[PDB]
Enzyme design. Structure first.
Site, short mmCIF file in Angstrom:
data_model
loop_
_atom_site.label_atom_id
_atom_site.label_comp_id
_atom_site.label_asym_id
_atom_site.label_seq_id
_atom_site.Cartn_x
_atom_site.Cartn_y
_atom_site.Cartn_z
N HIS A 138 -10.22 -6.54 3.92
CA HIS A 138 -10.10 -6.48 5.38
C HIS A 138 -11.12 -5.58 6.07
O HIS A 138 -11.25 -5.63 7.28
CB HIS A 138 -8.68 -6.06 5.73
CG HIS A 138 -8.32 -4.72 5.18
ND1 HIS A 138 -7.91 -4.55 3.88
CD2 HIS A 138 -8.38 -3.49 5.74
CE1 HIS A 138 -7.72 -3.26 3.66
NE2 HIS A 138 -7.98 -2.60 4.77
N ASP A 139 -11.83 -4.75 5.30
CA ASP A 139 -12.84 -3.85 5.85
C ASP A 139 -14.26 -4.33 5.62
O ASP A 139 -15.21 -3.63 5.96
CB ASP A 139 -12.72 -2.46 5.21
CG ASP A 139 -11.42 -1.77 5.55
OD1 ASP A 139 -11.09 -0.81 4.81
OD2 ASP A 139 -10.73 -2.19 6.52
N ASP A 190 0.82 -1.20 0.00
CA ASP A 190 0.00 0.00 0.00
C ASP A 190 0.85 1.24 0.00
O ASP A 190 1.92 1.28 0.62
CB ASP A 190 -0.95 0.12 1.18
CG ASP A 190 -1.97 -0.95 1.20
OD1 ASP A 190 -1.63 -2.14 1.33
OD2 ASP A 190 -3.15 -0.56 1.18
N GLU A 227 -8.65 3.55 -6.35
CA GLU A 227 -10.05 3.39 -5.97
C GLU A 227 -10.89 4.55 -6.49
O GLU A 227 -10.46 5.71 -6.48
CB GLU A 227 -10.14 3.15 -4.45
CG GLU A 227 -9.46 4.23 -3.60
CD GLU A 227 -9.38 3.87 -2.12
OE1 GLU A 227 -8.71 4.63 -1.37
OE2 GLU A 227 -9.92 2.80 -1.71
#
Ligand code: CA
Ligand code: CA
Lengths: 531, 531
Positions: free
Chosen positions: A318-319, A97, A251
């Site tokens: 993960h969210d 990231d 995104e």
């Protein structure tokens, strides 16, 4: 334009819950190294590892205190270098990231910045005097409350779009940009193959930080996708990414399919591919998700970026809660729905991402005690929408703690690991894992799933999501019955032959010249032929 | 028992506002070094420097992240070593703060502690599971809210009697105690002459951390001066302080004059001297502080610790407004009241402490804009009770920014520096500074002010505070008119002679066999004789 990133299958790792190599209950880098063979066996080729940078961890590691250092609990830089070497030996690509809108307030640059009103790094962040006893402006933080935090060391406030412990970097300052490009290139020179860019849509702030048109007002009109952002993003690309053979994933946050071409366009596009989240969260009706709305949302991205960009495909992260437990049915049609969902998003045009455990059908976890949960959000619906659903330890075997650790996991393993685990699923040729491996095999052996154009069929059908993929004389039909009740597939556009059925989650039944057939609950079929 | 600490005069330095040697606007260690000659000239011999340890500075430096390192803005350890050397060459003693009830949450020990439920340092802090969605107990933080802070890394809460960023050390753990004694001895071996012990009254927590008899309840009954605390304090003393010729200064927080003997008793007393704060804050009436209540409060400590302990005497500190501006009159009787207050507390039995600027009569600062203030408390009465009143830069000369810096001070200098500054006051033999120097000279030349017993006279007088000091045939009378109006001193206990007047803030008027006389506003006299 053919590229490795368009043809690859990405796998997302949440390091803390993937594999614990040293028994302290926290997944780490050595853990990942032990599982590279597994990734190869599965068939993926791009490994995305969530934040592993030094961080006080106040924001799930997105609050970075040192970009050139690994978070102690995950290992050392040597472990990371070894990870890249071992990953590359196996033909795998590794991306990390890139969190550059802000840093942790414990980052040495902010510590210097906040010390006095004049130090070399004061301008590296966004400081301003308040307005007679109150904040510099009325801007609210994405995390609730003021976007400004008073600092008694100087009498001024610093801007933090995110958490208080995430002061925003001053992109207006060329020194900040240059320090950031040196940091990016350091990683690129170290050998990583790209990045997943996080929250970069907020790097450009509106020019005098004026009040927006109310305690504090949601502030997106002052810092999100603001004019001039592309200047920074194009410079980021030219100074860094453009100098290497890598992939960047962004995104579409507050970005429509039309504005997305400026972000992911192939010629002048800051990123190679992009995630979109308009499909996230779909409550069931009386009779039972809204398949048509899913068809519309996913189809605009498919058609919208066709020959204009590239879609990063996914169902989990993960969210989010687990897909089979939210989009499917983990009670009666666990395996069927998991495979159905997999065929559904996996075979669209774009690069698919598999989140750790998704390939074995991991489900939501239902702990009775709130204390077994972690994310502060839950503590403040948990069983269904909780983030921890995707953070329980990866289920490797039926061994103690699913083979994740020899110690006590930082968070409990889901009690269903005795059944849902890699070891058991790899032995079972009808397992969700085996289905996933076949899907990966299919896409690699048929480039039509990579470069073939997508076309939605039966758009108005309430339960069936059917689409085709076309590349020259090579065609395929992906048909999925998204419901726990059978459904009639009826389409007089082509006659389906059972010898063309490449993959299904139900046994291949005999049928010739079929224009109609009843689909079992969550039945998914993938037909491939050549006209 | 005669000792250097009982005979010394201490000077308290708030490093950030004392002297800026490098122009960045923040006082530093080199600044202090430049002023050691000044301290010698003034006459003090013990230098107390407020927190200079590495700290994220979330709590005015009392949140320590590294006990073996100096806060970057104050200098380096070399600067500190040089400071001790230069201070000792001049015969000065140096003491620092000892903050051992807690550390910063950014201290490496807490960073390891909070990482997992089992790491070598987990037990170094106070972790506990909550009670069904809520905190481990109902304890409130001295800083408002819960004394517990949830930590998503493990699902448990850590105790913090003070700020969230000040997790409490687990004194129950022998490893913690031993690490702390090694730290103390490291400083003692480095050469410091003692410490000012902060908040150590909270080191002992009530044995199961039970709910106290209401969102959150003030928690003093669960962690303050709890039985067993003396076990830790006696061990602290034997393992550290007792091995060196130093001085320790404590505080009588929630300690009565009777319980104070266990803290400062000479044989078995953890500390050498102690501060008491029962006299802090005294609003004026219609006609004009309550002198009698001041006489009572100060007198119980004088008589209460006589031959049982030792009083640390003071009127100012970094957490209080200035004394002349609160206890005196900074408008009409600025110099008179400053000198009066000085004679009043300075000549009692104990070791006097002079806070930076007190010796020149620094007053409260009245900034019009709240933005010129710093302490978050003010931002949340400021002109009168604010902490910043004692944090504005020390006034050295009439030069730019009072000679404090060549840059921009981290906080503005009080506009009255052109008059109230060391340079100007040292030239003026009738200045507050000169009065202070004479007071220091008096106490050094007459040990009766050191070991002489205190006795209050005219206890019921509403304005005059008069007390004697007796050591063998050597006696002294300190008489002060604490009011802006004259007052008749009348006491038929002894006849005062003008040749015995050792010091006064008003000219020595002719008088023989005086048992009565009118005292001018804030007139203070010190008579010394030998019977
Ligand atoms: Ca580990
Ligand atoms: Ca300085």
């Amino acid at each position: 334009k053919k590229t490795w990133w368009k043809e690859g299958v990405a796998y997302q790792i949440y390091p803390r819950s993937f594999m614990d190599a040293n028994g302290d209950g926290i997944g780490d880098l050595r853990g990942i190294i032990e599982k590279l063979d597994y990734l190869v066996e599965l068939g993926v080729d791009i490994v995305w590892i969530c934040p592993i940078y030094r961080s006080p961890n106040a924001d799930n590691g997105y609050d970075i205190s040192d970009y050139y250092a690994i978070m102690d609990e995950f290992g050392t830089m040597d472990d990371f270098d070894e990870l890249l070497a071992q990953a590359h030996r196996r033909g795998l690509k590794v991306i990390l990231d890139l969190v550059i809108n802000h840093t942790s307030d414990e980052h040495p640059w902010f510590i210097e910045s906040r010390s006095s009103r004049d130090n070399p790094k004061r301008d590296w962040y966004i400081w301003r005097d308040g307005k007679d006893g109150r904040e510099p402006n009325n801007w609210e933080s994405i995390f609730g409350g003021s976007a400004w935090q008073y600092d008694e060391r100087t009498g001024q406030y610093y801007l933090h779009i995110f958490d208080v412990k995430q002061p925003d970097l001053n992109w207006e300052n060329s020194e900040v940009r240059q320090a950031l490009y040196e940091m990016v290139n350091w990683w690129l020179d170290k050998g990583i193959d790209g990045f997943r860019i996080d929250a970069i849509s907020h790097i450009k702030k509106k020019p005098g930080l004026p009040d927006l048109p109310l305690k504090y007002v949601p502030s997106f009109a002052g810092h999100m996708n603001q004019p001039g952002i592309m200047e920074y993003l194009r410079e980021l690309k030219e100074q860094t990414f453009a100098r290497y053979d890598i992939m960047t994933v962004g995104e579409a946050n507050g970005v429509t399919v039309d504005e997305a071409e400026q972000w992911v366009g192939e010629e002048n596009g800051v990123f190679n591919m992009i995630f979109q989240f308009e499909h996230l969260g779909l409550w069931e009706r009386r009779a039972s998700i809204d398949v048509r709305r899913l068809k519309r949302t996913l189809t605009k991205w498919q058609k919208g970026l066709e020959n204009r960009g590239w879609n990063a495909l996914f169902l989990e992260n993960h969210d989010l809660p687990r897909s089979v437990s939210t989009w499917g049915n983990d009670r009666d049609y666990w395996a069927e729905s998991a495979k159905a969902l997999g065929a559904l998003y996996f075979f669209m045009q774009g690069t698919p991402f598999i989140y750790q455990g998704q390939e074995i059908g991991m489900t939501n976890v239902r702990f009775d005690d709130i204390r077994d949960y972690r994310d502060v959000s839950a503590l403040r619906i948990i069983w269904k929408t909780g983030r921890d659903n995707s953070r329980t330890p990866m289920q490797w075997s039926g061994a103690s703690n699913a083979g994740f650790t020899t110690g006590t996991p930082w968070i409990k393993v889901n009690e269903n690991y005795r059944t849902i685990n890699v070891e058991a699923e790899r032995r079972d040729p009808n397992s969700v894992w085996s289905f996933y491996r076949q899907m990966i095999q299919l896409r690699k052996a048929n480039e039509l799933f990579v470069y073939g154009t997508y076309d939605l069929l039966l758009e108005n059908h309430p339960s069936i999501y059917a689409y085709t993929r076309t590349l020259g004389r090579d065609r395929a039909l992906v048909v999925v019955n998204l419901s726990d009740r059978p459904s009639l597939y009826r389409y007089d556009g082509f006659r389906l032959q059972s010898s063309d059925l490449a993959l299904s989650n139900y046994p291949v039944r005999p049928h010739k010249n079929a224009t109609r057939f009843k689909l079992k609950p969550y039945e998914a079929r993938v037909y491939i032929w050549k006209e």
